[PDB]
Amino acid sequence: NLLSLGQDSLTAAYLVNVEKNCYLNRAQMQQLQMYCPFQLPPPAIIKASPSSTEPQWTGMQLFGMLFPPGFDYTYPLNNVVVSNGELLSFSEGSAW
Amino acid sequence: SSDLQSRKNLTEEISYGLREAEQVCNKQQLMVESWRDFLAVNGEDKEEDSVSDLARFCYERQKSATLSELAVSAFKDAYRDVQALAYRYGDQSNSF
Amino acid sequence: TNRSTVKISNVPQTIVADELLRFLELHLGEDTVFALEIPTTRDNWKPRDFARVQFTTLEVKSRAQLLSSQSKLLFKTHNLRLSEAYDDIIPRPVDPRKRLDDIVLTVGFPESDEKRFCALEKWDGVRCWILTEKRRVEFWVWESGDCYKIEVRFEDIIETLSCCVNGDASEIDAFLLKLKYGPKVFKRVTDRYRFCKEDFDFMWIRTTDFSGSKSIGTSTCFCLEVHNGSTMLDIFSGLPYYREDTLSLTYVDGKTFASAAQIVPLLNA
Amino acid sequence: SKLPANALSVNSKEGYFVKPSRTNIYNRVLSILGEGITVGPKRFEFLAFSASQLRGNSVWMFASNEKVKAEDIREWMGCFRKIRSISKCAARMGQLFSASRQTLIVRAQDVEQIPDIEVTTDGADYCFSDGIGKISLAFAKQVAQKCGLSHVPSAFQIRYGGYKGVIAVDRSSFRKLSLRDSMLKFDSNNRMLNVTRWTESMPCFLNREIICLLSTLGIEDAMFEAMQAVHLSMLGNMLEDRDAALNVLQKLSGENSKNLLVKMLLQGYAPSSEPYLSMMLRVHHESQLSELKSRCRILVPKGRILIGCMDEMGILEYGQVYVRVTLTKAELKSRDQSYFRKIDEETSVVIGKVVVTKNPCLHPGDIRVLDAIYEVHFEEKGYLDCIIFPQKGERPHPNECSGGDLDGDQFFVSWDEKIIPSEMDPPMDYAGSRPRLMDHDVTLEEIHKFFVDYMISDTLGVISTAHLVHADRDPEKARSQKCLELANLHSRAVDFAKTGAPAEMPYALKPREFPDFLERFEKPTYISESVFGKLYRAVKSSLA
Amino acid sequence: IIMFEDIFVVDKLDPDGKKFDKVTRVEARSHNLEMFMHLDVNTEVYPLAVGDKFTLAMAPTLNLDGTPDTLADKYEYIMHGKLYKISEKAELYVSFGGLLMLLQGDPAHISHFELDQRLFLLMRKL
């Protein structure tokens, strides 16, 4: 490919997919959904604490709204599996 | 570094690593046809001569090109381990 | 429970032995850590992920294990996990009673048919350690600066006897160790990650007899001149084939039998 | 006990390279060897050491006397200044110390110089005649008179005047004695004849390495399990049955041996009576059980252990040999077999597939299937208790047998039919290390240095254990490069007694684990699921 | 409605840290059923120490008697994910939005799970 993500988008994607400990709430996820062309995935995080309402979204699902539903991607080196347009696994490497 | 003690430990470790790399380069400088008698498995009484002559190795290296190439290759090989210490002494939140 | 050294699973790579020692002394009792060693892949600038710590008392080891099982040990956001080790850092008995310091060691043999003993060479201020787990007894003798280690196993001795040196039958001030084989002789030869609480930065290599008159090579018995001990009999009762009888001895001047030749135990022609 | 490697020449890193440091025990041993041991009005001096004593740290010492001194005996044995190798000179000086029977004296007037045969294929020097010889019938009759031997063997190991090798009989001899070229080790001033071993037709045994190397060609575990089961069944029945005792004694130790217990076994009272014999049988059974527990030793009645020689015929090709052995009780009871030919009442020929194996074997390529054939011309020569090797071929049979020689070494033969000969593997290279030759004669000091250094880096006994452990752990044994490296190291260690080439055992090759069937109780024990583990479990169940 | 439910006891933690600010993978062994489990959990919001005992439940839907795609009041660590790999002692690979889970047990214990289906994860530390 001739066009890459760039010097900033690459770092942002690495931060999104690496931390895995910061959860985005409904308001921020809906605000970020405006730029993404695809729909909103299920929250996948109903309760993170005994007294925590407002179920949140994981960071890796935010990056999952950038792929078509019919697109499947597998990268064994970084253990990256994309099924039905959803990012399933990722460990490290940032090579893909 | 997390605090001053970690910084001092890192500085000492870097100094020892540089000393070890210099020793490795000095050892690698002996892989020439002139030291075939010394490198053989026999009885040589000039073992202390090759160690005490620390200021002559740099002068000999700076005069020859093949010796300089061997020295820089050995230094890079021994300095990769030194560079690897950043992941041990660096936090996950480090921007660099 | 056989040993006292405990292997820590994970420790931070940026720490030094002094920091871990201070943390252990803060959480546990004061000065309750004897030896602390952190293995290094390189010579002196690349420690490994684990470390081995030796405790003075088994009670301290049990308390440390209990604390580790409850995850109450947190040193630089790392949970220290404690596991048993394979070998001790220093071969030192846990029981302080078995440690004998500044005692008189002499060698000889049953020269006379009666209850008489002959002394060839006498050493003073020697260190005696009894290792029940290793089934061996270590004797540290300092001669001309460098110290020597005399190792006697339980199979080396055949009978254990107790005697006295003050001349009182009731008191016990000596112990006889009849040797069937010869004792092993060692010699001492000549830091950031090794505390060790002492000067144990050396190695032991086997050597020949260090005595000028070679009294060790011609002596089949060892005598331990020690002070009277109320509970010393219980400690000495652990040696195999112990006799519960009281025996008296007298010193015989046998300094004449001294051979400077390589073959010591042969008679003079 | 044996001196540990850490007690002599402890390694220490001084400078850029690690250099071993000699301990005080090294200097003490050197001083003892040099000055000597003084006992009373005598002073013993170093004469030499045999090959067996070299592996056991033993040496002969002789007290110098006014009549004959140590140097007098040394020069009387021979002149060793021609040998420039430290190890070779010691081996040649110590080889003349084996037990032997004195015979007649033959002068140096009638000695032949028959040329040998050499074949060079694929750039490799392969010599068929390493220590083979030729003997006449009259010489055999003369040498068998003083040993009280009735039957005349076709081959017997002999050494005299520095020569060493096995000689074979022939029907076209010229005179009493003959000799070849590749047999002179050193020049000697005497030519006394003596014989150590003539013939031993003992039943064959299966050691651990044989089963280890034969477990990959296709042999299943059911065969060995059934063989062990029948062996233990016949061993347990030997107590209360006198019939089995004689059969076992005639098929375990000695094909034709006369003894008080053997005679009474055939005709005797009940096992309950005669305590002198019953307790001996019980202790023999206990010894057999202990030996089986310590190591695997399968009693196979259809195989023998005999030496091999060659005949000056040149008819047999590469892969054709002759097998002939005596008839035991089992063979005499039923001599009708497909692969067994009743050539004579006492001697029976074999036409089955016979393989050749030795005691030390660590390479899968040693298994060489040989087809035995029957020829009238071969039988006319009258060969007994000796397998016949062809003169011509691409490579000699001893070379494929771990690079051996015809020096009277024993060979394992078996006319079995249930083995799998489909798989064949090439043997390993038999080329040794380059010999080391000095520029000066031996001053009786470098030999002492070599003798003392033999203890250091002597890893002969651990390579076999490591190979067995690796074979038991890793499946598809004797196929990976680790087994090949271990076999090469074992061969080099065996060659260490001949040439000064240390084995150099790597640290990473140590097993650090041992199976159940070992005496290393202190070392960690792991449950083995191989054929050896199954056999050991079966033995344990039978004992319990 | 609950397919799998058993008591689990943690054995060890992958980071073995308290304030690492990173997702922690736990190794818990089931009682009775003796099924090994891998799970990525956030210690900062849901603390979990070694030796603690917690229950685990899996249901296709949180509703009562159908309505796939009211158990919220019972548990406290509900998650949602899908099963993508079932090939193995069979094991399951369920990712809860990138948080991988490895439930290795017995073939008979895990038999009513289909491939590419949505399932929940109910947890409670007693």
UniProtKB/Swiss-Prot annotation, chain B:
It is found in: Nucleus. Disruption phenotype: Blocked in the perpetuation of CNN, CG and CNG methylation in repeated endogenous DNA accompanied by a reduction in long 24-26 nt siRNAs. Transient loss of post-transcriptional gene silencing (PTGS) in young leaves. Reduction of heterochromatin association into chromocenters, coincident with losses in cytosine methylation at pericentromeric 5S gene clusters and AtSN1 retroelements. Altered cell-to-cell movement of siRNAs beyond the vasculature. Release of transposon silencing. Not impaired RNA-directed DNA methylation-dependent (RdDM) silencing. It comes from the Eukaryota. Coiled coil: none annotated. Mostly expressed in flowers, and, to a lower extent, in leaves. Transmembrane segments: none annotated. DNA-dependent RNA polymerase catalyzes the transcription of DNA into RNA using the four ribonucleoside triphosphates as substrates. Largest and catalytic component of RNA polymerase IV which mediates 24-nt short-interfering RNAs (siRNA) accumulation. Implicated in siRNA-directed heterochromatin formation through the action of DCL3 and AGO4, and subsequent DNA methylation-dependent silencing of targeted sequences. Essential component of a self-reinforcing loop coupling de novo DNA methylation to siRNA production. Belongs to the RNA polymerase beta' chain family. Component of the RNA polymerase IV complex. Interacts with NRPD2, NRPD3, NRPD3B, NRPD4, NRPD5, NRPD5B, NRPD6A, NRPD7, NRPD7B, NRPD9A, NRPD9B, NRPD10, NRPD11, NRPD12, RDR2, RDM4, CLSY1, CLSY2, CLSY3, CLSY4 and SHH1. This is DNA-directed RNA polymerase IV subunit 1. The chain holds residues 630 to 725 of 1453 of the full protein.
From Swiss-Prot, chain C:
One of its GO terms (molecular function) is RNA-directed RNA polymerase activity. It comes from the Eukaryota. Its main location: nucleus. Disruption phenotype: Late flowering and absence of siRNAs derived from FWA tandem repeat regions. Loss of de novo methylation. Increased expression of retrotransposon-derived solo long terminal repeat (solo LTR) and SDC due to their derepression; levels are even higher in the double mutant rdr2-1 jmj24-1. One of its GO terms (cellular component) is nucleolus. It is found in: Nucleus, Nucleoplasm; Nucleus, Nucleolus; Nucleus. The keyword RNA-binding applies. Keywords: Magnesium, Metal-binding, Nucleotidyltransferase, Nucleus, RNA-binding, RNA-directed RNA polymerase, RNA-mediated gene silencing, Transferase. GO terms for biological process: defense response to fungus; siRNA processing; siRNA transcription; siRNA-mediated long-distance post-transcriptional gene silencing. Interacts with NRPD1 and SHH1. Associates with Pol IV complex, forming an interpolymerase channel bridging their active sites, through which the Pol IV-generated transcript is handed over to the RDR2 active site after being backtracked, where it is used as the template for double-stranded RNA (dsRNA) synthesis. Interacts with JMJ24. RDR2 is non-functional in the absence of associated Pol IV. Belongs to the RdRP family. RNA-dependent direct polymerase involved in the production of small interfering RNAs (siRNAs). Binds to single-stranded RNA (ssRNA); engages ssRNAs longer than 7 nucleotides and initiates internal to their 3' ends. Able to transcribe the RNA of an RNA/DNA hybrid, the transcript produced by Pol IV, if its 3' end is accessible, to generate double-stranded small interfering RNAs (dsRNAs) precursor essential for establishing and maintaining DNA methylation. This is RNA-dependent RNA polymerase 2. It comes from Arabidopsis thaliana. The chain holds residues 7 to 284 of 1133 of the full protein.
UniProtKB/Swiss-Prot annotation, chain E:
GO terms for biological process: DNA-templated transcription. Component of the RNA polymerase II, IV and V complexes. Associates with the mediator complex. This is DNA-directed RNA polymerases II, IV and V subunit 8B. GO terms for cellular component: RNA polymerase II, core complex; RNA polymerase IV complex; RNA polymerase V complex. It comes from the Eukaryota. SUPFAM superfamilies: Nucleic acid-binding proteins. Belongs to the eukaryotic RPB8 RNA polymerase subunit family. Keywords: Nucleus. Coiled coil: none annotated. SMART domains: RPOL8c (SM00658). GO terms for molecular function: DNA-directed RNA polymerase activity. The keyword Nucleus applies. It comes from Arabidopsis thaliana. The keyword Nucleus applies. The gene is NRPB8B. DNA-dependent RNA polymerase catalyzes the transcription of DNA into RNA using the four ribonucleoside triphosphates as substrates. Component of RNA polymerase II which synthesizes mRNA precursors and many functional non-coding RNAs. Pol II is the central component of the basal RNA polymerase II transcription machinery. It is composed of mobile elements that move relative to each other. It is found in: Nucleus.
